């Protein structure tokens, strides 16, 4: 549990508010020594509560000083910087004085400067390019940094030009501070950067997610036009027995609409799409687990495969991007159940090519949906 991490009361309070009740492995491996202020080099092949590692660790040690930035987190992806910032917000909910800001390209630097002069945050998240510019401009004062965090290091340090910028930013910070570096993979020349940034760091390599399998699943597909999907879906819902069902679609617009239609048709459904605050996405997926409703319509979830044991059928209402997403959508990784029914809709030659692509990758044949499906084959009793 997160209580064993011996974190500040208000920090544990926010943790309970978010949802997750069990720490991931990268968290058991890193958090303890990270809150002790130890330098850390962590290769985690994922995002499985990985950002929460440095967000909780830095918040735990944070000694807020008004108008002073004590924590700097930089990553390669603009979107990841954005999400890391929202995560700091969520976890510092019971630390009313804590301020966070995220800076990245795409937005006039004048806006960033305005924030730094008028209401400087204690924590800054950003992409190297913008962070370096604000620091050169002297808008961002990095002379008080006590925690220097880098994520997506492999991508961030891939090229000399960006590696040079990060080292330049690094030199503007105090020599005495905690440094943590996270990355999905350990590229070649990142070791040299690590040697310059950290000395004798605790090195943690977390065993990538235990991959999923299609073993034991019933898999089929149906060739139909797009405007024939709703009828087919609903007819199948009327015939196939299930406790709960998950339906995957390609967009937010499709997700919201399909879910609304089901709800109107007395098919209590819940929508979870890429256009919701993570806190909302998490809270909704939790509601679904609580078997609050029988149908979940979604653009994608939190990987790790199907973990809700009451879900008996997964519909790819819209064909999945690649085979890899098919696997993350269909595979079961719950506490007991291994049987399940997967049904894919094929509207054009492109979805078909992708479906054939899936049949080869995992060496499984996906037949056309038959008129009769034995319930005992996809539901455990």
- Are the C-beta atoms of residues 193 and 19 closer than 8 Å to each other? no
**223 has which bridge partners?**
346
Q: Which residues contact 363 (CB under 8 A, 6 or more apart)?
A: none
Tell me whether residue 25 is exposed, middle or buried, using C-beta atoms within 10 angstroms of its C-beta: 0 to 12, 13 to 18, 19 or more.
middle
Q: Where are the alpha helices (DSSP H) in 178-322?
A: 190-197, 229-239, 252-264, 278-289
Identify the sign of the CA torsion 302, 307, 308, 311. positive
DSSP 338: -
Quick one: CA torsion of 157, 161, 162, 165, rounded to 10 degrees? 120
> Which of 174, 347, 353 shows the shortest CA–CA distance to 250?
347
Q: Which residues contact 271 (CB under 8 A, 6 or more apart)?
A: 255, 256, 258, 259, 260, 284, 297, 298
Compute the distance between CA of residue 41 and CA of residue 1 in angstroms, rounded to an integer: 23
370 φ/ψ angles, rounded to the nearest 5 degrees? -85, 165
> Which of 219, 222, 218 shows the shortest CA–CA distance to 366?
219
DSSP 381: -
Tell me whether residue 297 is exposed, middle or buried, using C-beta atoms within 10 angstroms of its C-beta: 0 to 12, 13 to 18, 19 or more.
buried
Compute the distance between CA of residue 93 and CA of residue 10 in angstroms, rounded to an integer: 8
Between β-strands 218-223 and 341-346, what pairing exists: parallel, antiparallel or unpaired? Answer: parallel
221 three-state secondary structure? strand
Q: Is 45 left (phi over 0), alpha (psi -120 to 50) or beta?
A: left
Angle, helices 9-18/50-61, rounded to nearest 10 degrees: 150
Query: Does 337 carry a binding-site annotation?
Result: no
Compute the distance between CA of residue 180 and CA of residue 197 in angstroms, rounded to an integer: 9
> What is the H or E stretch that residue 112 is in?
helix 109-118
Query: Does 339 carry a binding-site annotation?
Result: no
- Are the C-beta atoms of residues 123 and 56 closer than 8 Å to each other? no
**306 has which bridge partners?**
332
Query: Does 47 carry a binding-site annotation?
Result: yes
Within 10 angstroms of residue 295's Cβ, the number of other Cβ atoms is 23
Query: What domains are defined for the chain?
Result: 1-205 (3.40.50.300), 218-381 (3.40.50.300)
Query: Does 48 carry a binding-site annotation?
Result: yes
Query: Does 367 carry a binding-site annotation?
Result: no
- Are the C-beta atoms of residues 296 and 281 closer than 8 Å to each other? no
Within 10 angstroms of residue 2's Cβ, the number of other Cβ atoms is 19
> Which of 113, 110, 91, 111 shows the shortest CA–CA distance to 100?
91
118 three-state secondary structure? helix
> What is the H or E stretch that residue 129 is in?
helix 128-136
Within 10 angstroms of residue 68's Cβ, the number of other Cβ atoms is 15
DSSP 295: E
Query: Does 85 carry a binding-site annotation?
Result: no
Identify the sign of the CA torsion 265, 268, 272, 278. positive
> Which of 330, 337, 308, 332 shows the shortest CA–CA distance to 248?
330
- Are the C-beta atoms of residues 123 and 133 closer than 8 Å to each other? no
> Which of 296, 308, 318 shows the shortest CA–CA distance to 340?
308
Q: Which residues contact 218 (CB under 8 A, 6 or more apart)?
A: 339, 340, 341, 342, 373, 377, 378
- Can you say how many angstroms the Cα of residue 305 is from the centroid of all Cα atoms in its chain? 13
Query: Does 251 carry a binding-site annotation?
Result: no
Compute the distance between CA of residue 251 and CA of residue 297 in angstroms, rounded to an integer: 11
Q: Which residues contact 1 (CB under 8 A, 6 or more apart)?
A: 21, 22, 23
Compute the distance between CA of residue 211 and CA of residue 156 in angstroms, rounded to an integer: 27
- Can you say how many angstroms the Cα of residue 52 is from the centroid of all Cα atoms in its chain? 11
Query: Does 46 carry a binding-site annotation?
Result: yes
Token representation of residue 54: 């440095």
């Amino acid at each position: 549990g997160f209580r064993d991490f011996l974190l500040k009361p208000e920090l544990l309070r926010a943790i309970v508010d978010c949802g997750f009740e069990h720490p991931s492995e990268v968290q058991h491996e890193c958090i303890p020594q990270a809150i002790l202020g130890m330098d850390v080099l962590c290769q985690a092949k994922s995002g499985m509560g990985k950002t929460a590692v440095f967000v909780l660790a830095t918040l735990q040690q944070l000694e807020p000083v008004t108008g002073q930035v004590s924590v700097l987190v930089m990553c390669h992806t603009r979107e990841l910087a954005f999400q890391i910032s929202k995560e700091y917000e969520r976890f510092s909910k019971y630390m009313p004085n804590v301020k966070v800001a995220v800076f990245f390209g795409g937005l006039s630097i004048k806006k960033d400067e305005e924030v730094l002069k008028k209401n400087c945050p204690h924590i800054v998240v950003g992409t190297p390019g913008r962070i370096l510019a604000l620091a050169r401009n002297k808008s961002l004062n990095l002379k008080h940094i006590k925690h220097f965090i880098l994520d997506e290091c492999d991508k961030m340090l891939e090229q000399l030009d960006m590696r040079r910028d990060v080292q330049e930013i690094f030199r503007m910070t105090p020599h005495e501070k905690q440094v943590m570096m996270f990355s999905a993979t350990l590229s070649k020349e990142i070791r040299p950067v690590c040697r310059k940034f950290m000395q004798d760091p605790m090195e943690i390599f977390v065993d990538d997610e235990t991959k999923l399998t299609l073993h034991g699943l019933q898999q089929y597909y149906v060739k139909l036009k797009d405007n024939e999907k709703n009828r087919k879906l609903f007819d199948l819902l009327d015939v196939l027995e299930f406790n709960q069902v998950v339906i995957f679609v390609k967009s937010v617009q499709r997700c919201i609409a399909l879910a609304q239609l089901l709800v109107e048709q007395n098919f209590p459904a819940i929508a979870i799409h890429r256009g919701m605050p993570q806190e909302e996405r998490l809270s909704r997926y939790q509601q679904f687990k609580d078997f609050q409703r029988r149908i979940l319509v979604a653009t994608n979830l939190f990987g790790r495969g199907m973990d809700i044991e009451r879900v008996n059928i997964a519909f790819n209402y819209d064909m999945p991007e690649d085979s890899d997403t098919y696997l993350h959508r269909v595979a079961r990784a719950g506490r007991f159940g291994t049987k399940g029914l997967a049904i894919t809709f094929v509207s054009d030659e492109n979805d078909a090519k992708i479906l054939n692509d899936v049949q080869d990758r995992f060496e499984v044949n996906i037949s056309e949906l038959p008129d009769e499906i034995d319930i005992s084959s996809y539901i455990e009793q």
